[PDB]
RNA sequence: CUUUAAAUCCUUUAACGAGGAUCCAUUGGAGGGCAAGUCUGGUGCCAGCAGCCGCGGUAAUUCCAGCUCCAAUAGCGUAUA
């Protein structure tokens, strides 16, 4: 129940010297503890189980089955996530999928459509994703038109925060796991696209490792 | 060869998805907190909002400093000003896309009479409009789907022959009085 | 496509016409042979008369002898088998009755566990089977 | 039994029960509102195992 | 009273005109898509349901009947291009 940090990231964030996970995303640090995100984010984080998939092995003495789960994670303002788990017990698969969804968390930088006023509500460009036969495409949309898609992109994007997006799919979209991973890859490639506002030469701030190595070397070896 | 019209158009559209809990619960909340009768009214308001949004998209996809774009631009802007949805702060072309179902469902006569405090309940307001009591500009309206404009908002009052705001009493009071006078003697 | 130019229209027109003609549903829906083989001839309903009542057996997985009516048409005289919709309505139909025969839902194809028969009966003796099943009217003899 | 080609057996032998009384509805105005407040306001479906409004447990 | 070649249709004003407002609101479904009971009785691969998968072999969440539920609601269901 009680958190005991074992990695350096958890010890530094429980040492109260890291403000947000934004600089973690600048330095692209791997996340290995799920409760660090619990330390950052408040009560705006909920879970939503997608579909329990009954896959099975087969042995000499009959066939043996185990349950494969999915879950969607991500607050309304900012980051998203996804987790896949498969185990014997459905409840342990649910908790494992929740933990793995807390591990893999990426943000999306929303853009505008044409004129710019207020806050961003749509994707900045036309981005695609594919991890199989699925060729899913994101299209920028005007303000307030609502997302239209298959309704599992609808629940994923309402978990995301992008309320205005057109979609286009191609292939065998009956398989939920491949299609969900493909739209996850499409929504995760938002930061991996060069933009005209970002051509200013980046500054290199001092790393938290570079300042707190002397603190961590006396904290935990 | 007859002097006929033959001009008919649809007003409500059916969604492609037959059954889904989200939009059904949303329109159910709209009917429950607005006192509509069926899905036809909310579908009609959604269709009018879709037509306005399509016209706005057709205006924004044109180029700036075009006379037609400016023409239906300030035409549509002044019409939404005259209905009483927008205000005097935001009269720009980029504020028309942020309108919701609430913005057009607020201007219904039933909701306006319920918010005016001249009735008790939302269904009571709907039937009180339906029972031919409340007039606008010395003209009675029995239809609850009356879009109230912004200028004609202080002209809502009971009619001259409405018994609730002065006039001849209806059937029930005179029948009760006649029955009491008959039973007294 | 493959050919891309300015003055490239005839070859692509011929390719579109040939590859549309090689479709199966388009060939079924745009040749007079399928319309000639259709007993209805594009008609939604077609009345007929009853000459016998023979019930056809079921298919391989399930076993239930479902009863059927053979109806001779009036516009063509072809002997086509119909199928009673509800349960116990074979007493409502007799020999040489005024029946109305329509399709079943698969665009003129065999449906379900009944082999060969593709049609059904919606009205017998100028009244529907629904009114006789719910007991709303009475069949006049 | 005996004669296999006999139709209407399940309705030929059955039990016949007459109808009952009937209340007043709201013609769908507050009927679906009662649906809302007896389906989602009072009880909620459990996350993992659903609970319908007609689930007579 | 008005409209109308004269009527009828609408509106207006008289007199009547509802307490279970009997002055009674119908159509297909309730295993999945597809919203909605492992409710209660009946025959138990027979009779049937089902556009697809299938459901029926002596406790059927699908068949036949009563209550409850679910969708549009003066509208709803089926076939054909």
């Amino acid at each position: 129940k009680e958190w005991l940090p074992v990695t350096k990231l958890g010890r530094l964030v429980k040492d109260m010297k890291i403000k947000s996970l934004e600089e973690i995303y600048l330095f692209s640090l791997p996340i290995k503890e799920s409760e660090i995100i619990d330390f950052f984010l408040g009560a705006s984080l909920k879970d939503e189980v997608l579909k329990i998939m009954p896959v099975q092995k087969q042995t000499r003495a009959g066939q043996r089955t185990r349950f494969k789960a999915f879950v969607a994670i991500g607050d309304y303002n900012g980051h998203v996530g996804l987790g896949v788990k498969c185990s014997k017990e459905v409840a342990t698969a649910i908790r494992g999928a929740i933990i793995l969804a807390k591990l893999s968390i990426v943000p999306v930088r929303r853009g505008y459509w044409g004129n710019k006023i207020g806050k961003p509500h749509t994707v900045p460009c036309k981005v695609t994703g594919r991890c199989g036969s699925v060729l899913v495409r994101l299209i920028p949309a005007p303000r307030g038109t609502g997302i239209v898609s298959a309704p599992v992109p609808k629940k994923l994007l309402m978990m995301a925060g992008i309320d205005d997006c057109y979609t286009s799919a191609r292939g065998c979209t009956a398989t939920l796991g491949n299609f969900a991973k493909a739209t996850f890859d499409a929504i995760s490639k938002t930061y991996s696209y060069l933009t005209p506002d970002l051509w200013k030469e980046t500054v290199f701030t001092k790393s938290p490792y570079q300042e707190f190595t002397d603190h961590l070397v006396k904290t935990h070896t | 060869p007859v002097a006929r019209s033959w001009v008919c158009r649809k007003t409500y559209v059916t969604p492609r998805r037959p059954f889904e809990k989200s939009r059904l619960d949303q329109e159910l909340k709209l009917i429950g907190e607005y006192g509509l009768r069926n899905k036809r009214e909310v579908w009609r308001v959604k269709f009018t909002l879709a037509k306005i949004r399509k016209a706005a998209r057709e205006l924004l996809t044109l180029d700036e400093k075009d006379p037609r774009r400016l023409f239906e631009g300030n035409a549509l802007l002044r019409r939404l000003v005259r209905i009483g949805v927008l205000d005097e702060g935001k009269m720009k072309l980029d504020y028309i896309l942020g309108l919701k179902i609430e913005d057009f469902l607020e201007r219904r006569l039933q909701t306006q009479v319920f918010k005016l405090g001249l009735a008790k309940s939302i269904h009571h307001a709907r039937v009180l409009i339906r029972q031919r009591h409340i007039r606008v500009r010395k003209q009675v309206v029995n239809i609850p789907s009356f879009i109230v404009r912004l200028d004609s908002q202080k002209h809502i009052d009971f009619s001259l022959r409405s018994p609730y705001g002065g006039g001849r009493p209806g059937r029930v009071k005179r029948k009760n009085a006649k029955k009491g006078q008959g039973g007294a003697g | 496509g493959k050919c891309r130019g300015l003055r490239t229209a005839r070859k692509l027109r011929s390719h579109r016409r040939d590859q549309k003609w090689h479709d199966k549903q388009y060939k079924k829906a745009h040749l007079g042979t399928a319309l000639k083989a259709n007993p209805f001839g594009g008609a939604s309903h077609a009345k007929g008369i009853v000459l016998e009542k023979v019930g056809v057996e079921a298919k391989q997985p399930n076993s239930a002898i479902r009863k059927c009516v053979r109806v001779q048409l009036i516009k063509n005289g072809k002997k086509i088998t119909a199928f009673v919709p509800n349960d116990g309505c074979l007493n409502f139909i007799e020999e040489n009755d005024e029946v109305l025969v329509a399709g079943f839902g698969r665009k003129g194809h065999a449906v379900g566990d009944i082999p060969g028969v593709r049609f059904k009966v919606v009205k017998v003796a100028n009244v529907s089977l629904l009114a006789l099943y719910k007991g709303k009217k009475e069949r006049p003899r | 039994h005996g004669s296999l080609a006999r139709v209407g057996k399940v309705r030929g032998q059955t039990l016949k029960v007459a109808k009952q009384e009937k209340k007043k509805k709201r013609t769908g105005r507050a009927k679906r509102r009662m649906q809302y407040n007896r389906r989602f306001v009072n009880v909620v479906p459990t996350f993992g195992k659903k609970k319908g409004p007609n689930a007579n447990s």
Side-chain angles (χ1 to χ4, degrees):
Chain A
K1 200 257 184 181
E2 186 72 25
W3 190 18
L4 294 174
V6 298
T7 52
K8 49 196 177 308
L9 283 87
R11 191 56 191 91
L12 266 297
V13 68
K14 211 175 187 176
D15 189 74
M16 272 205 88
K17 286 186 173 178
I18 294 180
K19 268 79 182 180
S20 178
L21 73 165
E22 303 183 358
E23 52 265 23
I24 302 182
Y25 286 156
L26 277 72
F27 285 95
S28 74
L29 297 199
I31 294 95
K32 301 304 292 316
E33 304 184 7
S34 58
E35 57 266 15
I36 313 177
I37 295 91
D38 291 331
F39 196 84
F40 293 105
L41 301 187
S44 182
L45 187 153
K46 314 165 292 163
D47 292 330
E48 202 294 339
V49 64
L50 277 300
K51 181 182 182 179
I52 306 302
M53 185 86 219
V55 300
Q56 59 185 356
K57 258 189 182 59
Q58 194 254 10
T59 53
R60 199 175 317 283
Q63 63 204 300
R64 174 231 68 78
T65 79
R66 68 178 191 267
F67 283 30
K68 185 174 186 174
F70 302 94
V71 70
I73 208 176
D75 51 352
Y76 293 100
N77 186 26
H79 320 269
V80 298
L82 187 71
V84 184
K85 195 63 178 180
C86 182
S87 67
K88 308 283 189 294
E89 171 66 33
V90 55
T92 63
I94 284 300
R95 312 301 141 180
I98 284 181
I99 287 301
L100 287 184
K102 291 175 70 59
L103 291 203
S104 177
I105 284 175
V106 285
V108 181
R109 62 180 295 276
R110 304 146 298 188
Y112 292 86
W113 185 83
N115 304 272
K116 173 182 304 177
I117 188 63
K119 305 181 186 304
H121 42 66
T122 187
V123 296
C125 71
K126 290 174 180 182
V127 65
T128 189
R130 169 185 49 85
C131 58
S133 75
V134 171
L135 279 75
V136 64
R137 186 178 182 179
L138 299 190
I139 301 299
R143 174 189 295 266
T145 182
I147 53 173
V148 71
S149 52
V152 63
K154 282 188 71 170
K155 59 174 54 60
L156 280 172
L157 269 296
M158 293 182 286
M159 281 325 317
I162 297 169
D163 62 358
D164 291 331
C165 184
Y166 310 112
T167 61
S168 179
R170 162 172 181 74
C172 180
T173 187
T175 75
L176 186 52
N178 293 342
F179 182 76
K181 286 177 63 178
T183 187
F184 201 50
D185 201 306
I187 203 180
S188 71
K189 283 280 300 309
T190 307
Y191 262 98
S192 299
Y193 189 81
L194 189 54
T195 46
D197 289 332
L198 265 58
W199 284 314
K200 186 184 287 184
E201 184 50 86
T202 175
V203 299
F204 309 106
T205 188
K206 200 165 180 63
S207 181
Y209 284 141
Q210 188 176 3
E211 303 176 4
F212 302 142
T213 307
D214 62 331
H215 294 89
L216 64 92
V217 74
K218 69 182 178 180
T219 306
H220 55 279
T221 60
Chain B
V2 294
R4 259 55 191 273
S5 178
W6 314 314
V7 189
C8 53
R9 61 190 297 176
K10 306 174 67 66
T11 317
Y12 64 93
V13 293
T14 61
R16 178 184 172 184
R17 285 326 211 190
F19 311 104
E20 184 178 1
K21 304 300 293 176
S22 302
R23 64 165 178 82
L24 194 141
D25 185 74
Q26 183 54 309
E27 68 196 7
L28 169 55
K29 184 171 301 306
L30 294 174
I31 292 176
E33 290 45 50
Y34 273 140
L36 300 182
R37 181 164 64 96
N38 50 8
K39 301 302 175 193
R40 272 143 170 252
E41 289 94 11
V42 55
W43 282 356
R44 159 184 68 181
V45 178
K46 279 204 273 202
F47 186 73
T48 56
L49 189 142
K51 285 185 294 183
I52 289 182
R53 283 191 60 93
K54 185 174 62 179
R57 176 169 49 185
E58 182 65 26
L59 286 188
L60 273 296
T61 188
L62 258 62
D63 63 335
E64 194 47 280
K65 298 293 183 182
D66 171 78
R68 195 191 78 91
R69 169 199 173 99
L70 290 178
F71 192 32
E72 291 83 4
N74 45 27
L76 184 55
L77 261 50
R78 205 261 309 155
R79 283 203 287 104
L80 276 296
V81 161
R82 197 162 68 97
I83 299 299
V85 176
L86 292 181
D87 57 333
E88 293 83 3
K90 317 299 179 61
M91 305 197 180
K92 271 75 71 177
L93 200 57
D94 62 358
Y95 287 107
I96 191 167
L97 303 178
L99 273 69
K100 275 77 69 177
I101 186 75
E102 201 275 300
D103 291 331
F104 287 158
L105 273 182
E106 207 275 334
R107 306 310 299 179
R108 198 181 180 92
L109 193 43
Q110 161 188 356
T111 69
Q112 193 72 211
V113 170
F114 173 71
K115 286 183 58 60
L116 269 175
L118 269 72
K120 285 297 185 59
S121 178
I122 305 102
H123 305 77
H124 187 207
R126 184 176 178 95
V127 299
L128 185 57
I129 301 299
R130 193 54 180 175
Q131 293 298 291
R132 306 181 57 253
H133 284 84
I134 297 169
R135 61 165 179 85
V136 294
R137 292 180 176 180
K138 307 176 65 63
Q139 208 276 327
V140 292
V141 169
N142 48 13
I143 306 304
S145 61
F146 184 87
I147 293 294
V148 183
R149 49 189 55 168
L150 177 57
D151 72 38
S152 179
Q153 206 167 359
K154 300 164 295 300
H155 307 80
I156 293 91
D157 197 74
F158 299 98
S159 62
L160 273 297
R161 216 210 313 276
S162 52
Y164 289 64
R168 188 169 67 96
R171 194 261 295 264
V172 186
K173 182 183 296 298
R174 65 175 185 178
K175 187 61 176 57
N176 187 26
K178 186 179 181 179
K179 184 185 301 178
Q181 288 186 2
Chain C
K2 176 175 297 299
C3 298
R4 286 158 295 197
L6 273 298
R7 302 142 42 179
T8 61
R10 264 154 178 146
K11 195 66 172 54
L12 200 152
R13 268 283 73 73
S14 304
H15 183 256
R16 289 294 93 196
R17 282 197 288 104
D18 289 338
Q19 296 296 327
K20 190 175 301 182
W21 205 249
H22 265 268
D23 198 10
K24 180 172 296 182
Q25 187 261 353
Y26 214 80
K27 194 180 184 185
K28 188 85 157 271
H30 283 266
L31 277 296
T33 310
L35 188 153
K36 174 250 175 185
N38 196 3
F40 286 168
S44 308
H45 320 270
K47 73 164 74 73
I49 53 182
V50 175
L51 60 89
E52 73 178 3
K53 288 186 295 180
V54 175
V56 66
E57 301 187 354
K59 272 308 278 207
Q60 309 287 335
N62 49 3
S63 185
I65 308 300
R66 289 166 182 81
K67 262 63 66 179
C68 285
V69 177
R70 176 169 301 275
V71 172
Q72 182 170 0
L73 271 299
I74 315 181
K75 60 166 61 178
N76 297 323
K78 301 180 177 183
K79 311 174 185 60
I80 319 293
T81 315
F83 164 68
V84 62
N86 291 329
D87 163 64
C89 300
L90 190 138
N91 298 264
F92 295 153
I93 190 167
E94 294 293 328
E95 186 155 52
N96 295 330
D97 292 9
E98 190 88 342
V99 302
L100 195 81
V101 186
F104 193 76
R106 218 186 175 184
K107 315 287 306 192
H109 205 256
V111 186
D113 44 359
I114 51 172
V117 57
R118 299 174 292 272
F119 292 164
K120 65 176 178 180
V121 175
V122 61
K123 293 173 61 178
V124 59
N126 295 27
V127 66
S128 63
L129 277 296
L130 183 63
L132 304 187
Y133 194 81
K134 288 165 164 321
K136 324 196 73 170
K137 292 179 182 179
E138 184 182 0
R139 185 250 195 275
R141 311 294 296 185
Chain D
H1 310 277
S3 179
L4 195 59
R6 178 71 274 172
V7 298
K9 180 182 179 182
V10 60
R11 209 176 59 171
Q13 53 89 29
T14 176
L15 276 79
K16 268 74 57 181
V17 186
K19 312 296 294 183
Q20 279 79 17
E21 56 91 19
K22 172 246 182 195
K23 277 75 69 178
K24 179 192 183 307
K25 63 186 179 68
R26 208 56 192 84
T27 74
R29 300 175 64 185
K31 174 201 304 179
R32 289 162 293 198
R33 184 66 178 172
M34 293 183 286
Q35 162 183 4
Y36 175 82
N37 52 63
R38 80 206 175 195
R39 187 178 184 270
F40 196 68
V41 167
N42 290 318
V43 75
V44 295
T46 300
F47 194 85
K49 291 183 178 58
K50 277 86 183 178
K51 191 256 179 182
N54 209 20
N56 44 8
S57 299

